[PDB]
Short mmCIF file of N, CA and C in Angstrom, two decimals:
data_model
loop_
_atom_site.label_atom_id
_atom_site.label_comp_id
_atom_site.label_asym_id
_atom_site.label_seq_id
_atom_site.Cartn_x
_atom_site.Cartn_y
_atom_site.Cartn_z
N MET C 26 -12.12 -15.81 4.50
CA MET C 26 -11.73 -16.54 3.27
C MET C 26 -11.06 -15.58 2.30
N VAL C 27 -10.41 -14.52 2.84
CA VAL C 27 -9.81 -13.37 2.08
C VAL C 27 -10.75 -12.32 1.36
N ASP C 28 -12.02 -12.69 1.16
CA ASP C 28 -12.99 -11.91 0.36
C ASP C 28 -13.45 -10.58 0.98
N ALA C 29 -13.28 -10.43 2.29
CA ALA C 29 -13.59 -9.16 2.95
C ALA C 29 -12.74 -8.02 2.38
N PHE C 30 -11.62 -8.39 1.73
CA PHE C 30 -10.63 -7.43 1.23
C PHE C 30 -10.98 -6.82 -0.13
N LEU C 31 -11.84 -7.52 -0.87
CA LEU C 31 -12.30 -7.10 -2.19
C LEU C 31 -13.18 -5.85 -2.18
N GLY C 32 -13.22 -5.15 -3.31
CA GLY C 32 -14.05 -3.96 -3.48
C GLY C 32 -13.24 -2.71 -3.74
N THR C 33 -13.87 -1.56 -3.48
CA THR C 33 -13.30 -0.23 -3.70
C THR C 33 -13.25 0.53 -2.38
N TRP C 34 -12.07 1.05 -2.03
CA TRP C 34 -11.86 1.78 -0.77
C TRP C 34 -11.50 3.20 -1.05
N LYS C 35 -11.85 4.09 -0.13
CA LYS C 35 -11.56 5.52 -0.26
C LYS C 35 -10.89 5.99 1.00
N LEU C 36 -9.82 6.76 0.88
CA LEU C 36 -9.15 7.33 2.06
C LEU C 36 -10.10 8.20 2.87
N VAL C 37 -10.10 8.02 4.19
CA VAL C 37 -10.86 8.91 5.07
C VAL C 37 -10.03 9.56 6.16
N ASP C 38 -8.73 9.28 6.16
CA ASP C 38 -7.83 9.88 7.13
C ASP C 38 -6.45 9.28 6.99
N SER C 39 -5.46 9.93 7.61
CA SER C 39 -4.07 9.53 7.55
C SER C 39 -3.25 10.40 8.50
N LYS C 40 -2.42 9.76 9.30
CA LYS C 40 -1.52 10.44 10.22
C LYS C 40 -0.12 9.82 10.13
N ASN C 41 0.90 10.69 10.09
CA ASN C 41 2.32 10.32 9.89
C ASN C 41 2.79 10.03 8.44
N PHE C 42 1.84 9.90 7.52
CA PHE C 42 2.00 9.98 6.04
C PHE C 42 3.25 10.63 5.46
N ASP C 43 3.64 11.77 6.02
CA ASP C 43 4.71 12.54 5.43
C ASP C 43 6.07 12.08 5.92
N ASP C 44 6.18 11.71 7.20
CA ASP C 44 7.46 11.21 7.74
C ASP C 44 7.85 9.89 7.07
N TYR C 45 6.86 9.18 6.57
CA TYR C 45 7.12 7.89 5.93
C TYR C 45 7.81 8.06 4.58
N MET C 46 7.38 9.06 3.81
CA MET C 46 7.98 9.39 2.52
C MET C 46 9.31 10.13 2.64
N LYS C 47 9.50 10.90 3.71
CA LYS C 47 10.82 11.47 3.99
C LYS C 47 11.82 10.34 4.33
N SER C 48 11.37 9.31 5.07
CA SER C 48 12.28 8.26 5.55
C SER C 48 12.81 7.38 4.41
N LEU C 49 12.00 7.32 3.34
CA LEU C 49 12.29 6.61 2.10
C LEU C 49 12.99 7.58 1.18
N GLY C 50 13.01 8.86 1.58
CA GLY C 50 13.75 9.92 0.88
C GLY C 50 13.09 10.48 -0.36
N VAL C 51 11.77 10.26 -0.44
CA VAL C 51 10.86 10.87 -1.44
C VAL C 51 10.99 12.42 -1.45
N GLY C 52 11.00 13.04 -2.64
CA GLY C 52 11.24 14.50 -2.74
C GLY C 52 10.09 15.39 -2.25
N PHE C 53 10.40 16.51 -1.60
CA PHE C 53 9.35 17.44 -1.10
C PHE C 53 8.26 17.62 -2.15
N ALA C 54 8.68 18.04 -3.34
CA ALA C 54 7.78 18.30 -4.47
C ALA C 54 6.76 17.18 -4.59
N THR C 55 7.26 16.00 -4.93
CA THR C 55 6.50 14.75 -4.90
C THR C 55 5.72 14.56 -3.59
N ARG C 56 6.39 14.67 -2.43
CA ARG C 56 5.73 14.54 -1.10
C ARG C 56 4.49 15.40 -0.87
N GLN C 57 4.39 16.56 -1.51
CA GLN C 57 3.31 17.47 -1.12
C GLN C 57 2.03 17.38 -1.95
N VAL C 58 2.16 17.39 -3.28
CA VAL C 58 1.07 17.00 -4.18
C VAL C 58 0.39 15.71 -3.71
N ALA C 59 1.20 14.66 -3.58
CA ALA C 59 0.74 13.32 -3.24
C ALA C 59 0.29 13.19 -1.78
N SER C 60 0.65 14.16 -0.94
CA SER C 60 0.22 14.21 0.46
C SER C 60 -1.11 14.94 0.60
N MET C 61 -1.42 15.82 -0.34
CA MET C 61 -2.68 16.57 -0.30
C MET C 61 -3.85 15.73 -0.79
N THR C 62 -3.56 14.78 -1.70
CA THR C 62 -4.58 13.91 -2.33
C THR C 62 -5.23 12.85 -1.41
N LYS C 63 -6.42 12.42 -1.79
CA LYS C 63 -7.11 11.34 -1.11
C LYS C 63 -7.48 10.29 -2.16
N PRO C 64 -6.69 9.20 -2.22
CA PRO C 64 -6.80 8.24 -3.31
C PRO C 64 -7.86 7.16 -3.10
N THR C 65 -8.21 6.49 -4.19
CA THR C 65 -9.12 5.37 -4.09
C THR C 65 -8.34 4.07 -4.36
N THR C 66 -8.39 3.13 -3.41
CA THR C 66 -7.79 1.82 -3.60
C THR C 66 -8.83 0.78 -4.01
N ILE C 67 -8.42 -0.13 -4.89
CA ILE C 67 -9.29 -1.21 -5.24
C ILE C 67 -8.58 -2.50 -4.86
N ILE C 68 -9.32 -3.45 -4.30
CA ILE C 68 -8.75 -4.78 -4.14
C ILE C 68 -9.59 -5.81 -4.91
N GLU C 69 -8.92 -6.53 -5.80
CA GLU C 69 -9.58 -7.34 -6.79
C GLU C 69 -8.94 -8.71 -6.83
N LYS C 70 -9.77 -9.72 -6.72
CA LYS C 70 -9.32 -11.09 -6.89
C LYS C 70 -9.68 -11.50 -8.29
N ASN C 71 -8.87 -12.38 -8.85
CA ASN C 71 -9.21 -13.07 -10.09
C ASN C 71 -8.60 -14.48 -10.12
N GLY C 72 -9.35 -15.46 -9.62
CA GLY C 72 -8.82 -16.81 -9.46
C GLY C 72 -7.68 -16.74 -8.46
N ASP C 73 -6.48 -17.11 -8.91
CA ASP C 73 -5.28 -17.12 -8.08
C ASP C 73 -4.72 -15.74 -7.81
N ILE C 74 -5.03 -14.83 -8.74
CA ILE C 74 -4.35 -13.55 -8.88
C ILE C 74 -5.12 -12.45 -8.18
N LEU C 75 -4.42 -11.62 -7.42
CA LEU C 75 -5.00 -10.40 -6.89
C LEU C 75 -4.37 -9.21 -7.55
N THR C 76 -4.85 -8.02 -7.18
CA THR C 76 -4.49 -6.77 -7.86
C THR C 76 -4.76 -5.58 -6.95
N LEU C 77 -3.77 -4.70 -6.86
CA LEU C 77 -3.85 -3.48 -6.05
C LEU C 77 -3.83 -2.22 -6.94
N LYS C 78 -5.02 -1.68 -7.19
CA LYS C 78 -5.14 -0.48 -7.97
C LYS C 78 -5.07 0.65 -6.99
N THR C 79 -4.27 1.64 -7.36
CA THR C 79 -4.22 2.93 -6.68
C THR C 79 -4.68 3.96 -7.71
N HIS C 80 -5.59 4.83 -7.28
CA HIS C 80 -6.16 5.86 -8.12
C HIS C 80 -6.14 7.16 -7.32
N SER C 81 -5.17 8.01 -7.66
CA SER C 81 -5.16 9.39 -7.19
C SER C 81 -4.85 10.26 -8.38
N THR C 82 -5.36 11.48 -8.35
CA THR C 82 -4.94 12.53 -9.28
C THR C 82 -3.39 12.63 -9.45
N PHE C 83 -2.64 12.06 -8.50
CA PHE C 83 -1.17 12.02 -8.51
C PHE C 83 -0.53 10.80 -9.22
N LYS C 84 -1.01 9.59 -8.89
CA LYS C 84 -0.54 8.33 -9.50
C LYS C 84 -1.63 7.29 -9.73
N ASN C 85 -1.39 6.47 -10.76
CA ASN C 85 -2.23 5.35 -11.14
C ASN C 85 -1.39 4.10 -11.32
N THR C 86 -1.73 3.10 -10.51
CA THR C 86 -0.94 1.87 -10.38
C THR C 86 -1.84 0.63 -10.26
N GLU C 87 -1.36 -0.46 -10.84
CA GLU C 87 -1.96 -1.78 -10.77
C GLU C 87 -0.81 -2.77 -10.64
N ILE C 88 -0.88 -3.65 -9.64
CA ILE C 88 0.07 -4.75 -9.50
C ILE C 88 -0.69 -6.04 -9.25
N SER C 89 -0.43 -7.05 -10.07
CA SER C 89 -1.03 -8.34 -9.85
C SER C 89 -0.01 -9.30 -9.33
N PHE C 90 -0.48 -10.21 -8.48
CA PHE C 90 0.37 -11.20 -7.88
C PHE C 90 -0.41 -12.41 -7.42
N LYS C 91 0.32 -13.52 -7.26
CA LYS C 91 -0.09 -14.68 -6.47
C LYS C 91 0.38 -14.53 -5.02
N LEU C 92 -0.47 -14.84 -4.05
CA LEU C 92 0.01 -14.81 -2.65
C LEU C 92 1.11 -15.84 -2.47
N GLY C 93 2.15 -15.43 -1.74
CA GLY C 93 3.25 -16.30 -1.34
C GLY C 93 4.28 -16.48 -2.40
N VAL C 94 4.05 -15.84 -3.56
CA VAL C 94 4.96 -15.89 -4.71
C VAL C 94 5.61 -14.52 -4.89
N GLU C 95 6.94 -14.52 -4.86
CA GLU C 95 7.75 -13.32 -4.87
C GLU C 95 7.80 -12.75 -6.26
N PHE C 96 8.00 -11.43 -6.36
CA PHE C 96 8.05 -10.73 -7.66
C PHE C 96 8.97 -9.50 -7.66
N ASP C 97 9.35 -9.04 -8.84
CA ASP C 97 10.25 -7.86 -8.93
C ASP C 97 9.39 -6.64 -9.05
N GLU C 98 9.75 -5.56 -8.38
CA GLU C 98 8.95 -4.38 -8.60
C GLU C 98 9.78 -3.14 -8.42
N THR C 99 9.37 -2.11 -9.14
CA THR C 99 9.88 -0.78 -9.08
C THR C 99 8.68 -0.06 -8.44
N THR C 100 8.89 0.78 -7.43
CA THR C 100 7.75 1.55 -6.94
C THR C 100 7.47 2.83 -7.82
N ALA C 101 6.87 3.88 -7.24
CA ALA C 101 6.85 5.19 -7.89
C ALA C 101 7.92 6.08 -7.28
N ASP C 102 8.74 5.50 -6.38
CA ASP C 102 10.02 6.11 -5.85
C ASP C 102 11.28 5.61 -6.61
N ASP C 103 11.04 4.66 -7.51
CA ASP C 103 12.02 4.09 -8.43
C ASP C 103 13.11 3.17 -7.88
N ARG C 104 12.81 2.47 -6.79
CA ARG C 104 13.74 1.53 -6.20
C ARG C 104 13.37 0.18 -6.75
N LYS C 105 14.36 -0.57 -7.22
CA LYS C 105 14.15 -1.98 -7.58
C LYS C 105 14.05 -2.73 -6.27
N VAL C 106 12.91 -3.38 -6.06
CA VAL C 106 12.71 -4.16 -4.87
C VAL C 106 12.30 -5.61 -5.18
N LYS C 107 12.44 -6.48 -4.19
CA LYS C 107 11.91 -7.83 -4.20
C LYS C 107 10.72 -7.79 -3.25
N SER C 108 9.60 -8.29 -3.75
CA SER C 108 8.36 -8.08 -3.09
C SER C 108 7.68 -9.42 -2.94
N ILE C 109 6.85 -9.54 -1.90
CA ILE C 109 6.02 -10.72 -1.65
C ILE C 109 4.81 -10.28 -0.83
N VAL C 110 3.63 -10.79 -1.20
CA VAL C 110 2.38 -10.46 -0.46
C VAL C 110 1.77 -11.71 0.14
N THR C 111 1.44 -11.64 1.42
CA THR C 111 0.91 -12.79 2.10
C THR C 111 -0.32 -12.49 2.91
N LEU C 112 -0.92 -13.56 3.43
CA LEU C 112 -2.01 -13.47 4.39
C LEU C 112 -1.65 -14.10 5.73
N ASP C 113 -1.31 -13.24 6.68
CA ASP C 113 -0.91 -13.72 7.98
C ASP C 113 -2.02 -13.57 9.02
N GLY C 114 -3.14 -14.24 8.79
CA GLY C 114 -4.23 -14.24 9.80
C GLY C 114 -5.08 -12.99 9.71
N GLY C 115 -5.78 -12.86 8.58
CA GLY C 115 -6.53 -11.66 8.26
C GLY C 115 -5.78 -10.33 8.28
N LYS C 116 -4.43 -10.36 8.32
CA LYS C 116 -3.57 -9.18 8.07
C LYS C 116 -2.91 -9.32 6.69
N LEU C 117 -3.27 -8.50 5.71
CA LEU C 117 -2.58 -8.60 4.37
C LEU C 117 -1.22 -7.87 4.39
N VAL C 118 -0.15 -8.61 4.14
CA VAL C 118 1.17 -8.04 4.31
C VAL C 118 1.87 -8.02 2.99
N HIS C 119 2.42 -6.85 2.69
CA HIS C 119 3.12 -6.57 1.47
C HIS C 119 4.47 -6.24 2.02
N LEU C 120 5.45 -7.10 1.76
CA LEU C 120 6.81 -6.76 2.15
C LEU C 120 7.55 -6.33 0.88
N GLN C 121 8.48 -5.39 1.03
CA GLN C 121 9.31 -4.93 -0.09
C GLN C 121 10.71 -4.89 0.45
N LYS C 122 11.68 -5.43 -0.29
CA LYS C 122 13.07 -5.45 0.16
C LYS C 122 14.07 -5.01 -0.91
N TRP C 123 15.14 -4.34 -0.48
CA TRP C 123 16.28 -4.08 -1.38
C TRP C 123 17.57 -3.86 -0.58
N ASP C 124 18.72 -4.21 -1.16
CA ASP C 124 20.02 -3.93 -0.55
C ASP C 124 19.96 -3.60 0.93
N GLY C 125 19.85 -4.69 1.73
CA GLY C 125 19.92 -4.60 3.19
C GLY C 125 19.17 -3.40 3.78
N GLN C 126 17.84 -3.51 3.71
CA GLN C 126 16.90 -2.49 4.14
C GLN C 126 15.58 -2.97 3.55
N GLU C 127 14.45 -2.50 4.10
CA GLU C 127 13.11 -2.96 3.71
C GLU C 127 11.91 -2.13 4.25
N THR C 128 10.71 -2.42 3.74
CA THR C 128 9.49 -1.70 4.11
C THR C 128 8.22 -2.56 4.01
N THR C 129 7.26 -2.31 4.91
CA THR C 129 6.08 -3.13 5.09
C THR C 129 4.78 -2.35 4.84
N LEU C 130 3.94 -2.81 3.92
CA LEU C 130 2.58 -2.24 3.74
C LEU C 130 1.51 -3.24 4.27
N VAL C 131 1.23 -3.18 5.57
CA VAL C 131 0.28 -4.10 6.23
C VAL C 131 -1.11 -3.54 6.26
N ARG C 132 -2.08 -4.29 5.72
CA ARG C 132 -3.47 -3.81 5.51
C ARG C 132 -4.56 -4.59 6.28
N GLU C 133 -4.90 -4.20 7.51
CA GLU C 133 -5.97 -4.95 8.25
C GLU C 133 -7.41 -4.42 8.15
N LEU C 134 -8.34 -5.20 8.69
CA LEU C 134 -9.73 -4.78 8.85
C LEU C 134 -10.02 -4.60 10.35
N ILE C 135 -10.14 -3.35 10.78
CA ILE C 135 -10.45 -3.02 12.16
C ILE C 135 -11.60 -2.02 12.15
N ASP C 136 -12.75 -2.46 12.65
CA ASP C 136 -14.10 -1.94 12.32
C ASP C 136 -14.54 -2.65 11.05
N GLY C 137 -15.24 -1.93 10.18
CA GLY C 137 -15.21 -2.25 8.76
C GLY C 137 -14.38 -1.16 8.09
N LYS C 138 -13.17 -0.90 8.61
CA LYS C 138 -12.39 0.22 8.11
C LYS C 138 -10.96 -0.23 7.90
N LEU C 139 -10.66 -0.57 6.65
CA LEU C 139 -9.34 -1.06 6.27
C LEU C 139 -8.27 -0.06 6.73
N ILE C 140 -7.47 -0.50 7.69
CA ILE C 140 -6.33 0.26 8.13
C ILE C 140 -5.15 -0.31 7.34
N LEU C 141 -4.24 0.59 6.94
CA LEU C 141 -3.02 0.24 6.26
C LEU C 141 -1.86 0.86 7.05
N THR C 142 -1.05 0.05 7.72
CA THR C 142 0.07 0.62 8.47
C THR C 142 1.27 0.49 7.57
N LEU C 143 2.20 1.46 7.68
CA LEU C 143 3.32 1.64 6.74
C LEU C 143 4.63 1.90 7.50
N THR C 144 5.44 0.87 7.60
CA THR C 144 6.58 0.86 8.50
C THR C 144 7.83 0.78 7.65
N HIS C 145 8.69 1.80 7.79
CA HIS C 145 10.02 1.88 7.18
C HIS C 145 10.99 2.27 8.27
N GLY C 146 11.60 1.27 8.93
CA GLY C 146 12.55 1.53 10.03
C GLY C 146 11.82 2.09 11.24
N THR C 147 12.29 3.22 11.79
CA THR C 147 11.62 3.91 12.92
C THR C 147 10.61 4.94 12.44
N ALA C 148 9.70 4.52 11.58
CA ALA C 148 8.83 5.46 10.89
C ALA C 148 7.55 4.74 10.51
N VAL C 149 6.47 5.15 11.15
CA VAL C 149 5.20 4.46 11.03
C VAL C 149 4.12 5.47 10.62
N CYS C 150 3.18 5.02 9.80
CA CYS C 150 2.05 5.81 9.29
C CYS C 150 0.78 4.96 9.37
N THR C 151 -0.36 5.59 9.62
CA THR C 151 -1.64 4.88 9.55
C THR C 151 -2.59 5.57 8.55
N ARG C 152 -3.25 4.81 7.67
CA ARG C 152 -4.13 5.38 6.63
C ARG C 152 -5.49 4.65 6.42
N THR C 153 -6.59 5.25 6.89
CA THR C 153 -7.89 4.58 6.98
C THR C 153 -8.80 4.69 5.76
N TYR C 154 -9.24 3.55 5.21
CA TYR C 154 -10.14 3.49 4.05
C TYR C 154 -11.57 3.01 4.41
N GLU C 155 -12.59 3.60 3.78
CA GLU C 155 -13.97 3.15 3.94
C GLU C 155 -14.47 2.57 2.64
N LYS C 156 -15.45 1.67 2.71
CA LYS C 156 -15.90 0.90 1.55
C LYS C 156 -16.85 1.67 0.59
N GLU C 157 -16.88 1.25 -0.68
CA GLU C 157 -17.82 1.77 -1.71
C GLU C 157 -18.33 0.63 -2.61
N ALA C 158 -19.44 0.88 -3.31
CA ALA C 158 -19.98 -0.07 -4.29
C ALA C 158 -19.73 0.40 -5.73
#
């Protein structure tokens, strides 16, 4: 019923992380500070509205949305994108698009361990979160 996604998550591992930010053309400087960190994600429902908090010593972000309703967003890479978040069968999918090109932040539950796969063209990353109270 989507509620398994709620709570506070903590990074416990990540592989290919760096090739993903190079493929989006993120700067080394930026790439390395933010690659050394282990952030805390929060997933929060509020009626219709959800929210993705990112908490790292590097960046702090909150985005609220309705599922299936598109929105404008600037990332922390500064690209104006068109974004939409959906639920495709217990896979939470965040699509981001701009000028004929795009990227996917897909967040599943495999174990009780939220996996987030990150696909930008021929460039894939996996990042595992564990739950907290």
